[PDB]
Ligand binder design. Sequence first.
Ligand code: DGT
Ligand code: CA
Ligand code: CA
Ligand code: CA
Ligand code: CA
Length: 343
Amino acid sequence: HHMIVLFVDFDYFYAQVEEVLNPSLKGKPVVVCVFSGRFEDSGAVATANYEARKFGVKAGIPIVEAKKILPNAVYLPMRKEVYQQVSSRIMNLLREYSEKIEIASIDEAYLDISDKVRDYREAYNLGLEIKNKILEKEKITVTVGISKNKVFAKIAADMAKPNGIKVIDDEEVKRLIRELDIADVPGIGNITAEKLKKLGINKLVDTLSIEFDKLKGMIGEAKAKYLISLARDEYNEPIRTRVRKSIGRIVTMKRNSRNLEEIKPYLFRAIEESYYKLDKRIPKAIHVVAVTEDLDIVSRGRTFPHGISKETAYSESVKLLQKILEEDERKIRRIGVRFSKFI
DNA sequence: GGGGGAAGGATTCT
DNA sequence: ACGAATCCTTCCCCC
Ligand SMILES: Nc1nc2c(ncn2[C@H]2C[C@H](O)[C@@H](COP(=O)(O)OP(=O)(O)OP(=O)(O)O)O2)c(=O)[nH]1
Ligand SMILES: [Ca+2]
Ligand SMILES: [Ca+2]
Ligand SMILES: [Ca+2]
Ligand SMILES: [Ca+2]
């Protein structure tokens, strides 16, 4: 009659993996950190388990502030490659439940189980079978969301987290479209949430009382059509494979700088790691990205009529870096590169 | 008018 | 006080 989407989101992923790899951590507050090297505990928290998030320690806060709060918790350096491989294996399993699987991030995917189930009961049961299987195979708990479309599947999981499973039937979808704060709609951050308030829109439904063109004028057409769809209970994007369209590395310097020679080593380090990661991929475009001292972001790039060799990336990146320092007077704090337009 | 594409910045999100 | 997709606006070349 319509689509049946099942969304899967692993719980406090990075930290749970640290637990799996060292179960003696369970029960204790675990904090996976991103150490910037600027000083002792400079950096931010990538994520934390619930035992630590109930005290305010979470993704985003400085490491120093988290220690102010939980001086005795366990602080571990982020090990991105490890969580990715654990993630891949879990994605492979889900893959065994549908052909139409959309891997949205390192720890979440949507499955189109439209022709694997009939009605939500079976759907609900396919959920447990999945949770139970990932738990057994990898000992990772995950939350499951099930609804008529990706957006509501996602919302379903946010509401059941953690270690939960939830269904939002078409009847209930019609309540959310009236009761759900527009801000909690995926893809609607602070900037959009506030533009929406100023226009009197606090709930999805409200997007129906406003003139379309005004919406578009205030938050863009893409975002306007998006909200109106969900609002008209007509949203139906299909689950679909998504391949990486960009690869890059950005690093924080020990000190902010404008001296080309102090910045080069970091930039070159970024290019190295990036190329290593490109694997058998050849980019036609390169961008140099810089985070200025006032945590602002400037970038300069160029697209070549052919692929980019490492030597070409080294040379071109230095020129783009020079463009930045020239057109922007602020000191540079973070420097990096991003490659795209793969051949 | 429109199409096509490329830069650079804005937003979001995990 | 730390990697990546989508979208918006402007600028440009041109039939
Ligand atoms: N470096 C960095 N990584 C993040 C950040 N937020 C999330 N991540 C990465 C590592 C986290 O383990 C993974 C988390 O995905 P989610 O934020 O959706 O949930 P998490 O797994 O954090 O726990 P949860 O979904 O809230 O139960 O994504 C962030 O702000 N900075
Ligand atoms: Ca998660
Ligand atoms: Ca997630
Ligand atoms: Ca939000
Ligand atoms: Ca998130």
